[PDB]
Each structure stands twice: as structure tokens, then as C-alpha cells.
Design a protein around this ligand. Sequence first.
Ligand SMILES: N#Cc1cc(Cl)cc(Oc2c(Cl)ccc(CNC(=O)c3[nH]c(CO)nc3Cl)c2F)c1
Lengths: 406, 560
Amino acid sequence: IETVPVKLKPGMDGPKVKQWPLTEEKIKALVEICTEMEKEGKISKIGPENPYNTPVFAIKKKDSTKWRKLVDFRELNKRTQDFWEVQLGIPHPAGLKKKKSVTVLDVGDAYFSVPLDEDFRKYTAFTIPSINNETPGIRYQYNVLPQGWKGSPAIFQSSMTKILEPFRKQNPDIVIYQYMDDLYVGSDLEIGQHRTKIEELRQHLLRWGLTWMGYELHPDKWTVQPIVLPEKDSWTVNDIQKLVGKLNWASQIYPGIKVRQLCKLLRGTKALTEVIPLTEEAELELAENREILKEPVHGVYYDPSKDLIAEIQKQGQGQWTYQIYQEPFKNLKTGKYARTNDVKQLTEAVQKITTESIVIWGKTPKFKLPIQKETWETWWTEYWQATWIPEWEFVNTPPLVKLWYQ
Amino acid sequence: NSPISPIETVPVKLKPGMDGPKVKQWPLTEEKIKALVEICTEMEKEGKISKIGPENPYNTPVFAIKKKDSTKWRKLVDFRELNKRTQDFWEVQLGIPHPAGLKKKKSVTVLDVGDAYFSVPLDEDFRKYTAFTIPSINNETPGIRYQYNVLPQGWKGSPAIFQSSMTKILEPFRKQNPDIVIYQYMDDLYVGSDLEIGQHRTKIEELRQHLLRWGLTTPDKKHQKEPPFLWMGYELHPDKWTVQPIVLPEKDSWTVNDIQKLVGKLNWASQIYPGIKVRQLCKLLRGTKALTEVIPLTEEAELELAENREILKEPVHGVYYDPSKDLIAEIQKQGQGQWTYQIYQEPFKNLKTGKYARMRGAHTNDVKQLTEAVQKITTESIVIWGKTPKFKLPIQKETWETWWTEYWQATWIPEWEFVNTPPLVKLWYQLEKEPIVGAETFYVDGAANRETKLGKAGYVTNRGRQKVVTLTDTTNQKTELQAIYLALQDSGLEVNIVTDSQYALGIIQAQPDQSESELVNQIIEQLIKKEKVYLAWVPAHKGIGGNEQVDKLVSAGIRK
Ligand SMILES: N#Cc1cc(Cl)cc(Oc2c(Cl)ccc(CNC(=O)c3[nH]c(CO)nc3Cl)c2F)c1
């Protein structure tokens, strides 16, 4: 095909991102993979006059044993946003979150058929490192559309539309959405039928040369996590304090939350253990709050011009709570993930949350991750199975925000 | 003179939107102008440079220099302007090889490439920018002008293009000799094989010849260096390695410059000599400085330096790597937030040692520090050997599980085992999960005025006690930690404390055993002495009983 020209933004230059150290296991795995890709003309070696670099990793595809190459194009994605978001943006359907079942198909191989604009190829440079800096370490750039680059499906969009034209016409109540290397297919059908339609879709795809969650996603079986309040026969000064604290912070999110009566009960300087029977006023004030918490938040709406943030809290016992928002306390979504080690678990939550985020908004969020930068950066690739990588930053975000959510 | 390689040239470009350099040549002495003509003629003959006329509009200044007791002249070209204008290249070497990561070889040869940069051509399209000019006697007539055909000294692209060239030239040989190891470093190549010396001395030659067929000359068997190799501050013997000798000076008076260099010599030593410390020596440098100014040693610093001399007394060596075996890393606490470690494959023959002795933040505990140290050692091992080691740590498996399961940050040590080498890492107190019956409930608060900085800290308790101490040059944060500190002193062994400071709570819930803050360190001493502390939080200015009353006391003449 005639190659689509890609203009980088004015002012911005291509990525200069250092490669995180890899283990021998993964370096050998990458050397094997890159050799074949060279033979197949997908990548070519480059000289020192290419100053750019993007990191690479090796993972195992979700529930499998072969190694897969995963290029981290986060920088290059930021610096080419005008191309893929505005100039050739793939529109997100709101239908998708409503469907009974959504299936995720990897379609990244599609891209290796379409050549990449020769003037852009240098920006896709990357390095396979070596152990103990033995050798200078192997440098490649891409000749075809690379997996992980948000530009790739943007380009391929018109080819994907032809591939899917027959299927869509034959199935007008099935929603198909391309996000990066994956296709998202949603139907209201009986699950047996759904899977029959997926196999049918596989066969269409197969004719263009293309061979933390369950098989399918169930969006309509996603509902809120109410901030719940305990129910007891006997209450202590401490319990009330904890409750007022919990209620207090809740009132920044939910308008109408009230604690006037509750506070009245604590008047004095009382021992924490001393029990305190509730008055009719207060019990009714509590009941009123409890009503407000079950229901959704009024006034909070997704703004497509703003980044999504995700905060995650470690609840112990393999439990993790999480909130998605754009402006603090205007939560667009809240949830919980359950059940290994802290890092394995945390990476499972991130991928799960990201996936839901793609389904609901066609956007991944920037994660605030409760963990040491280095610990995270060493280990995450051991359990990562997604084809994409979200933006993350690291935080020390205690203390009772933890208790306020579970 | 010497060859120039036929290797393809690397296309090179100026930075977008910039034209080449056009710096004016400054007039020189006849002496220099003569030296330079002699040199450039000699270079032209050899192919390194070529004469070009005044058609070429670019110029870089040139200079000659000769040392005081000498007769050889040297040419210096000042490429600062061309370097500003040349593209960025790919960074040469991500790091430098550690000895401990070298695999032992039956025979090992070092080959320096002679005149490396002058042995490689420069992109023809780019030569024009390398123009310089030898000027006339008192700049009357126009000068003689030249350009490089090879990689110039001090040009921005030479290091990278050279390495790139050596790589491409080595590729074939490597493919046809997979069992031979060739390290690349600058002009050098280090070549190691397990072949018998006869076949090794053969293979070296095929290389030397393969290299020569691409214009790269190398020293012959007679001129080749011998074991032990001195290299980058290391000694590399046939089955061991060490740091090159360390001379700790003995001085009447120590200057900043003397101490700076000492810390460095020790820090360098720490990678194979176990137990090296530099904390007390580093503390001295934490000041206004002034290289030649003398700093008198403190007792702690003299004890530390003396202990370091003792360690350095007899020489110590490290073994080489063996990829069949595992790596075992042991860590020990030296106290003062100093940690020391050793990595071996067969005990106790160290591949290397090291130290971690860092302060991440302000408030911390040993369990956190040990995790960090483990994390640091793990990255180190991935860089040197390509795998992570099995750890052996002075922490009960029980102590570790309690910490991580209850702490709020994700944390994870890979496969490890407990080893009883005191001091052991423990937690020195824990906070109760539930209020304590029959314990005095202190409600504590602090307030500071922002203009005057005058604070008040105090409590009210359910037994009707109260106190209010006044503080000078303080802040809201400090008053709130004073408030908790008062409640700890005045209470007895069991106590409940209510506060409206998330700041205090957060610090204290992470179970710190050391701080940069003096007040935190006092609060710590107390928490250890207690038998049971429960510590709860209520939001401030909500009229929560108890909190409201201490709020009135501390606000008196401080805030409204
Ligand atoms: N100068 C220098 C230098 C620097 C480096 Cl990083 C490596 C180097 O060569 C070595 C290579 Cl390529 C591989 C292993 C070692 C460790 N030393 C040996 O194996 C070794 N063997 C013998 C004789 O059997 N002498 C030495 Cl030294 C090597 F020393 C030489």
C-alpha cells in the first residue's frame, strides 16, 4: 500500500527513553523474535545516527507459554497524539458498555502487512540489551506498523472497516470497537450464540491473513460499590467517631450527607469504650445518609477532553478497592478486585481496571499506584499480559482512605 | 602511515534548521603556523585530511601546542561550534562491565585498536563542515584550508560511529565463533576463549587479520599485555579479581579535598571489601565546604576510619561468575541505617560485596530499609548476571508476613530464607486495633500562628485531666506531634489517643523506628515503653466532644 505520512507535532521530538534492564531469559527470547522479524522484513538494523529509543520487554501472552514482544510506545504515543486522536481518531461507541457480553480478540498481526512511512521509521527505534554490557546491544527500527503504537490502528482503520463490512451488515446489533491491538465485540446474544458469532468473526479475519478476566466480559453485570456503613446492636464513642469520620469524608462526594445529630451524641470528653445508645433523631439521620449512599452521584459526568485517573487501595486479604475520576471526589466509577503476592495482584487489578476503562470510555487512565517505583519497575513484566501499557505514577497515599472504602 | 577502513560510512546530519560552523580563525605565531603545516602535510599524505579551496564557506579554529620539556607539536581543533550543530547520536554504552560478571576463561587477550578514529572514514556529504584553516604570516595572504576524511578527535559523533563500525566489522567473526567472547570497550577488545592456548593464539590471529582486512590494526603477540590486567580501577587475574591498591593517607589535618577523595577511595573499595562504612566521614562534608579548609575529625569519624584501615589491612579478592550455579545474596545490618551485603555462588567465596546506607524520606524502619536494600541488590544482579539471586536475610519469616499483610503499600521480596546473624530486623512496637477498656482516653491537639510562629500543644482526658504547653518558633505540624508526645509522657502504660492530625497518624502508623525529626524520635522512645497504645482519628472543627475542648485550649491567643 501507499504509506500514510505521519507528521510529529511541531516543537516535540521523538522519544529518548532508556531501556530498563532485562534478564537473560527475556533477552534470549527477544533475540530469537527479532531475528525472525528481520528475515520477514518487519524491522531492520539501524546505525548510531538514529538517536531515538523506546523500551522493549518480553511477556507471556495471556495464559500461554510462547514469549511475546511488547514495545512500550508511551512516549511516542504522547508525542503523536494529534495524528491518532484528532487527524485519524477512532470513535468510541457508548453501546459497548451496555451489551451482555463483550469478547476481546487480539488483531495485532494485522498491522505487520502495512508498511510504515519511511520518514517516521526512525522514531520507532529500540534496543535489545546485553548482560554486563558485554556487547553494545542490538538496535532496530520498524518497517511496518508496530504493535503498541496508537498510530497503527489509526492508519489501519480503513482496512479494518472493509474486513468487517460483511459481518456488520449481517449482524447490525453487534458492536465492534478497535482499541490498539485489540478488537472488542459486544452482543446481547445467548452466550452460545455469542461465541458462535465470534468464531464466525474469526473466519472473516482469517481470510485477510490473521490467525483477572474470564473468556468474555460482562459489562451489564457491572454496578457500583456503595460506600457502606456498619449496622450494629451496640455503639461505642469510637464506633461513632469512626462513623462520623467515614461519613465526613463521604460528604465531599455525596451532597446532603449530615452528621449534626451524630456529633451531639459525643458531647463531653468520653472514654472510647463507653457505649452510647442512639436517639431517634440520630438513627433517622443515619438512615437518611444510608439512602444517599446506595444511589448514584448527581452532577458528575465524563469529559472527553480530560485524562482519567485511577487510584487503588490495598485492603489486605487479597482485596483491592479502586476509584476512577477526572476531578477529585467526582468519581466516575468505583470498584473492588479480589484474589500470589502484592505485585502480581496489583498488576492484575491494573489490567482489569484498564480494560473496563477502554470499554466504558475508549481511554486508559493514569494510575496512582501504592508501591515503590523500583519494585514495580522490576516485577510488573513478570505477570503482565496486556498488549498495551497505561500511564502510571507512584504514591504514598495512606491512611483511612483505605478504611473509607471497604 | 596507517590504513583507513573501506567500511560503509554512517550518514551524518546537522541539527534541523542549523547551517554549519563559520568561526573566524585567529592569527598564530610562525612557530605554530610552521608546526601545523608540517603536521597537515603529513596527515594529507596519509589520507586523513584533504586540501580544499575557498569555495567551502565553513570554518573551525585550529591551534598548536607543545609541552614545556618537549619537541613534538600537536594540532588542536576546537569543534565546539560544529558539535553544537551536529545531530544527537545514540548513547555509546548503557554501562561498563563489572568484573564479578565476567565468566572465567582458560586464555584471555587484550587488543587495543591503534589510532581508532583516524582508521574510520567520515560521511563524504559531511566532510565540508570539518573545514579548518592554517593562516598566513600576520594574516596577509589567505590561509591553507583542509577538511577531514576520517573521524576527527573531539567531534561529537566519533565515539558512536567508531563503535558502530567495530560492531559491523565483528558480526561475521562472532557468528562463525559463537564460543569466543569479545567484549567491546572504547578502542579496546577483550578476547577470551576456553580453547587450548595453541588454538587460541591461532584464533586471535584470524581476528587480527579479519580486523586488518577492514583497516583496523592491533598489537601482535609480542606487544600484547599480560595478566594481571590493570583496567578501570580493577585488577583482573586468571581466576580472581580485586580493586587496584588503595592508599589511605595519614594526615595531621584533613581538608575537604582530602576527605572527599577518601570517601571515594572507600566507596570504590566497598565493592569487594566487606563491611566498609562511610557514614561518619560523609557527615563531615555536609556543610558550607571550601576544598582547602581543614575539618577536624570527630571521635566517631576516627573510629570509622580506623575500622576501615583494619578491613583494608590484608588484601581481599573476588571470584568470577559461573552461570551453572545460583547467586546467593546475604545482607547484614551495620546499624545507623547502614546495610552491608555479599554475593556468592559457593559460600563464602564472594563474587562481590556492596553497601546500602540510604534514607528514603524522613521516617522509616528497618523492615522498610531491608526491602529497599533487597530491591537495590536485585536490580544490580539483573544488570551484572541477568538473573536475580536467592536472598538470605536477618528477618523472621513471621516478622515479614505481619508487616506486609498489614502495611498499605504493595511490597514483595522474591524467594528468600531467614539467617540468624544479629542484629535481627524486628518491629519495636505495634499499635492496637481496638480501643483499650480501662485506659485513659487523651484527646490531643496543637495549633500554631503563622505570623508569630507561637504555638500551643495540649490535651484533655476523660478523667478530666488537662495540660497546655506553649511553644515558640513552631508550625502546625510540630504542635500536633508535641500534642501526641505530651499525651505519651503523662499517661501510663495503656492509653488511647484521639487526634485530628492525619499527618501525625500517618507517620506513626508506619511504625517508624528512626527519624530525621527529634520529636518523632522522642515519640518513638515512648511508644516502645508503652504496653498498649490505640490511636484514632477524628475530623477537626466538627464539634466532636473531647476534640472540641482541647481545640479551645490550644486556640487561646493563637487562632480564632
Ligand atoms: N584489560 C582488560 C580486560 C577488561 C575486561 Cl572487562 C575483560 C578482559 O578479559 C576477560 C575476559 Cl574477555 C573474560 C574473562 C576475564 C576474567 N579473566 C580471565 O578469564 C583470565 N584468564 C586468564 C588466563 O587463563 N587470565 C585472565 Cl585475567 C577477563 F579478564 C580484559
